[PDB]
Each structure stands twice: as C-alpha cells, then as structure tokens.
Amino acid sequence: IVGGTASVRGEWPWQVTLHTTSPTQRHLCGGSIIGNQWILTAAHCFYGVESPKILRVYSGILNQAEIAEDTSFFGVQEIIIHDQYKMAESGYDIALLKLETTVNYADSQRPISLPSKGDRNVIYTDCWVTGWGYRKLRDKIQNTLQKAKIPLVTNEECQKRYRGHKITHKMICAGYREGGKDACKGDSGGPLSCKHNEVWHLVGITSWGEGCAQRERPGVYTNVVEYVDWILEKTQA
Ligand SMILES: *[B@@]1(C2=[C][C]=C([C]([C][N]C([N])=[N])OC(=O)C3=[C][C]=[C]N=[C]3)[C]=[C]2)O[C][C]([C][O])O1
C-alpha cells in the first residue's frame, strides 16, 4: 500500500495474509474471510502454485512479526480459480480458498459481507484498500498492515486511463487523479472495503494497475458483486 498508514489491530478482521512455504516461507498475497471455511482472493496469486500444500493462511494478523514457526495457521484444502481467468488484466481475477479447517470467529477474525446485486446503484464514498504490500516501487513486504482511503472512479473514467486495456463491468477502479495512494506488489488478493450504512462490504479485490500510485493511473479491482452467483455456486457443497 502506497501512501497509507499503519492499521489498528482488529480494524480489518476479514483480512488474511496468505503465505507460501516454498522455497522458504513468505507472504504471497492478501485475502478476505467470507465464510467459516472460505477465503476470497485474486486468481493471479497462484501463478506457479502447483499444490495447495505449500499455502498457509493466517488470520487476525497485524504485524508479520506475529508470524513464526510456532504460530497457528489454516491449511488450504483446495484452490478454486474461476474457469475463465487467464490473467489479471483480462478480468476474472478471482479465486476461492477452501480451508482444511473452520475459522472460529472473534473480534480479530470475522467475515466481511459480500455486496448485494441491489447495491450496484449504491455510491460508496468510504472505501479503503489494505495490505502488507510495497510502500514504494521495487521495495519489499511491510511488517504492519497498511491502510489507505481511496475514492472509487467510474469505469468510463478508468477506461480513459487505460486506453490499451478493456475495462469491463466486472472490474472497478479506485485512485486519486493525482496518484499518491494505491495498492502495490504484495497487496494482490486483498480487499477493497467500503463502509456503507455502518456496514462493511467487500466491493473489490486488488487485481492490477500500472506501477504504483501514479498520476492518472487508478488501481483496478475485481468487481466482486459481479461474482456473487459464482461464489455461491463454488462454495455450495
Ligand atoms: B500482487 C500485485 C499487487 C499490485 C501490483 C501493482 C499494481 N497496483 C496498483 N497500481 N493498484 O504493480 C506493481 O507493484 C508493479 C508493476 C510493474 C512493475 N513494478 C511494480 C502488482 C502485483 O501482489 C502480489 C503479486 C503476486 O503475483 O501480485
């Protein structure tokens, strides 16, 4: 997260830090708890991941320093990638992680409500992107969970900033026309949370962008509401 600040413990209880143990353990991507056994994240996070066995999900985490060899974690039983996904910039950058065990909710770890199709007309004015990603470019994973408030931008306006891409209705962008605040490497898969009527919604999933926090280069996120049907179908035993 570029241009953000340190988060408060338990402030983003749905945020998880997804790690890979190969070759040696490290943060790989962000993710959001959406069910007692489900994490919603980005599909491009699993490039090269041949098996869910090397994945480890950590919830109720603020600082990466909290994570040690003796720290409890959730194993991944199954990785579910949307069957139409090819690459982040093409859309369909969404994936589900079925945990080997159930998450016991608490103030430090609880789910985030998915957006309702009857909210597409709703205009979010209080959205934040969070993560342990780079603060600058060519940097490194941060210790403390960073947060940054970022206004959404219309797709028509986003399309203007990405003339070489096709910004579909399954994508949603956010950023300041002057840059400065934005998601960056390591923030992938994390949530874009908007607070509407005292309730938090998982509006988007950090997917891609051009560089980090550049002027006239809004971050691009998966438009979660466009996938509630997909999510139901895939999480229904
Ligand atoms: B992801 C991941 C997250 C962010 C980025 C960013 C784009 N973000 C944005 N502007 N909203 O791009 C870079 O940081 C970047 C791009 C090109 C050259 N240098 C840096 C990219 C990727 O987080 C984990 C990673 C795993 O695949 O994906």
* Catalytic residue check, 201: no
Collapsed DSSP state (helix, strand, coil) of residue 7: coil
Question: Class assignment of domain 1-12+112-226?
Answer: mainly beta
- How many degrees, rounded to 5, is the angle at CA 149 between CA 26 and CA 106? 60
Architecture of domain 13-111+227-237: Beta Barrel (2.40)
* Catalytic residue check, 70: no
Count of residues in the chain: 237
- Best mutation site among 128, 212, 220, 221 for ligand 1, i.e. most ligand atoms within 8 A of its Cβ? 212
Answer whether 33's CB lies under 8 Å from 51's CB.
Answer: no
- Method for structure elucidation: X-ray
Q: How many Cβ atoms sit within 10 Å of the Cβ of residue 69?
A: 5
Q: In what order do the strands lie in the sheet with 199-208?
A: 5-6, 146-149, 127-131, 191-196, 199-208, 219-223, 171-174, 152-153
Strands 199-208 and 191-196: antiparallel
Residue pointed to by tokens 């399309």: 159
Burial string for 159-178 (b: 16+ CB within 10 Å, else e) reads: bebbeebebeebbbbbbbee
DSSP state at residue 114 = P
Which atom belonging to ligand 1 lies closest to the Cα atom of 47? 27
Instruction: State how far the Cα of 108 lies from the Cα of 106, in Å rounded to an integer.
Output: 5
Residues of the chain with CATH 2.40.10.10: 1-12+112-226, 13-111+227-237
Two tokens, residue 35: 């069910």
Answer whether 225's CB lies under 8 Å from 120's CB.
Answer: yes
Whether the CB of 150 sits within 6 Å of ligand 1: no
Resolution in units of Å: 2.5
Whether the CB of 212 sits within 6 Å of ligand 1: yes
